[PDB]
């Protein structure tokens, strides 16, 4: 709902005479860019009722559980799903169950079925003859999507995670002798994305787009994609998500006008340099 699945255990786990029960939140994902949010009541948030609650993994959502043999074992979510977005904060609080909630946004493309788990377990809290419930989240991600319209600035000079970086975007750009600037061509309804270089220093994509018509007029006032294309969405626009130097964009179906835009990227260079180099990135929308 609203591209967000919520598992809210706030009112699911309190001790009752018939507890413990198992409260299972089943999240099934088969479409792009879904945000998953999990709320787990904190010990002490109500006087007695969560006194022995525990959440697993402690480092959720960075670390998740998967089922191996018959056991739940900890794995890094970013290794399970390339391009997944974990932001450091949720409403300006650490993205960690010690603040009561975690969130992450799944990417435009998932190649293989992936199933992982979180636990929010109040079944060891007792009060008189009551016991709390055991909360479990099962996230089942089905394969979905196809390559992302956009560009992957790849770390090698020429042509297990390196394989994903090379199959995820429609245009690959290698470090050495690049003769093809990134050109992301989108139409109404499309998802786009750029994996920015590992040694990126800064970029004006996509907060400072410059419109142009055939020839570049360097003086033209810049504007964000969100302000140029009403109801567009940019993901990880802060580029503060862990692991992946990526941004995604979505162009709404409502948007049927044509734009030609550019932004640019600066790399980390030897401090010996007097002159810095900005490399242009081209974005077109509904190019006729
Ligand atoms: C920018 O878009 C908003 C919201 O867009 C609407 O919802 C989308 C899902 C899509 O279906 C669009 O066709 C819609 O316009 C516009 O604001 C709204 O205007 C509509 C009139 O059609 C009205 O019914 C809504 O209640 C309004 N909602 C809000 C939050 O204002 C807004 O006018 C657009 N801005 C420009 C400059 O075009």
Numbering used by the authors: 587 to 745, 759 to 887
Q: What is the paper's account of this structure, in its own sentences?
A:
Pfs230 is the largest member of the 6-cysteine protein family with 14 consecutive 6-cysteine domains and is expressed on the surface of gametocytes and gametes. Pfs230 is one of the leading transmission-blocking malaria vaccine candidates in development. In P. falciparum, Pfs230-deficient males are unable to bind to red blood cells and establish exflagellation centers showing that Pfs230 is critical for fertilization and gamete fusion. The 6-cys domain is a β-sandwich fold formed by two β-sheets of mixed parallel and antiparallel β-strands, with typically six disulfide-bonded cysteines that are positionally conserved.
To elucidate the structure of the first two 6-cys domains of Pfs230, we expressed Pfs230 D1D2 (aa 587–889), which contains the first two 6-cys domains and Pfs230 Pro-D1D2 (aa 532–889), which has a part of the prodomain and the first two 6-cys domains. We determined the crystal structure of Pfs230 D1D2 by single isomorphous replacement with anomalous scattering and used it to solve the phase problem of Pfs230 Pro-D1D2 by molecular replacement. For Pfs230 D1D2 one molecule is present in the asymmetric unit with all residues defined except for 13 residues of a loop within the D2 domain and two residues at the C-terminus. The D1 domain of Pfs230 D1D2 folds into a three-on-four β-sandwich and as typical for A-type 6-cys domains, the first two β-strands are pinned together by a disulfide bond between C593 and C611. A second disulfide bond is formed by C626 and C706. A short linker region connects the Pfs230 D1 domain with the D2 domain, which folds into a B-type 6-cys domain with disulfide bonds at C736–C781 and C804–C862. The orientation of the two domains towards each other is similar to tandem pairs of other 6-cys proteins such as Pf12, Pf41 and Pf12p, and is stabilized by several inter-domain contacts. In addition, our Pfs230 D1D2 structure highlights that the Pfs230 D1 domain is stable and well-folded without the prodomain. In contrast, LMIV230-01 did not form a complex with Pfs230 D1D2 showing that its extensive interactions with prodomain residues are critical for its binding to Pfs230.
